[PDB]
Design a protein around this ligand. Structure first.
Ligand SMILES: [Zn+2]
Ligand SMILES: [Zn+2]
Length: 258
């Protein structure tokens, strides 16, 4: 529950930053500061008006990357909101705010999971990476695609990539996303982690453009994350209990995988 608490605190810190695309508003800095403290190598890839982060712990393959974005969609009229959109207020077990579901809650859970994992296993096989962009929700010409190009140009590999977009439809863990728009161990690892943590089996469905670009590297790409019912809406929120479970699920995934 200590870990749950860390996930929630980080999510609030992120939510409070009004990172309307492509403006990062310091979210990637918060994130890089925490990881750097645990021995992660920090690489900044800014391009035009977009901020991108590539953070890695480890040297060897397999390379497992967590990918996500710090940007959020406009709020709409504030008179429609019960809590102000960037307040990160917790009401009857729900964390409210623009970004809470899409995707700052899940971003916080991936981060806490990577940290927890590295703290327990500093000599872990393979490499744990985070790939974070400030522009997924708008035009995205200079976001994840820039990072992918940069990595490909120097023959740097990603084996597996967990895209922390909110994938759950009715109940947390009910839906995982994989495959191609037009028709491995990662899928296995996340499926088991979900089963083991919350006792249900996800349905694999056939998808963000961002995931789509990472897949061009020949990474196995899977999307998993919280309930998506409230994304891009007023009074966007996410269950704190769910954030807690996400943390556990991601950590378990790494265990399973590495
Ligand atoms: Zn979105
Ligand atoms: Zn998103």
């Amino acid at each position: 529950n200590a870990m749950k608490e860390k996930v929630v605190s980080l999510a609030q810190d992120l939510i409070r930053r009004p990172s309307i695309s492509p403006n990062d508003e310091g979210c990637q800095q918060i994130i890089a500061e925490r990881l750097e403290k645990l021995g992660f190598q920090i690489e900044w890839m800014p391009f035009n008006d977009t901020l991108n982060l590539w953070a890695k712990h480890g040297t060897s393959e397999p390379v497992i990357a967590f990918a996500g974005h710090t940007d959020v969609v406009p709020t709409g009229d504030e008179n429609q909101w019960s809590s102000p959109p960037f307040s990160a207020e917790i009401i009857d077990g729900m964390l409210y705010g623009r970004g809470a579901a899409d995707m700052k809650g899940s971003l916080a859970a991936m981060i806490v999971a990577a940290e927890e994992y590295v703290k327990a296993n500093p000599n872990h096989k393979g490499t744990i990476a985070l790939l974070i962009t400030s522009d997924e929700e708008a035009t995205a010409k200079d976001g994840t695609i820039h990072v992918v190009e940069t990595l490909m140009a120097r023959d740097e590999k990603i084996t597996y990539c967990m895209v922390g977009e909110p994938s759950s439809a009715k109940n947390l863990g009910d839906v995982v996303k994989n495959g191609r728009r037009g028709g491995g161990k990662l899928l296995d690892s996340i499926t088991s982690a979900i089963e083991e943590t919350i006792g249900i089996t996800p349905k694999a469905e056939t998808g963000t453009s961002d995931g789509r670009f990472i897949a061009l590297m020949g990474a196995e790409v899977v999307e998993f994350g919280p309930l998506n019912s409230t994304i891009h809406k007023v009074n966007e929120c996410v269950s704190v209990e769910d954030l807690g479970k996400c943390g556990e699920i991601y950590h378990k995934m790494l265990v399973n995988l590495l």
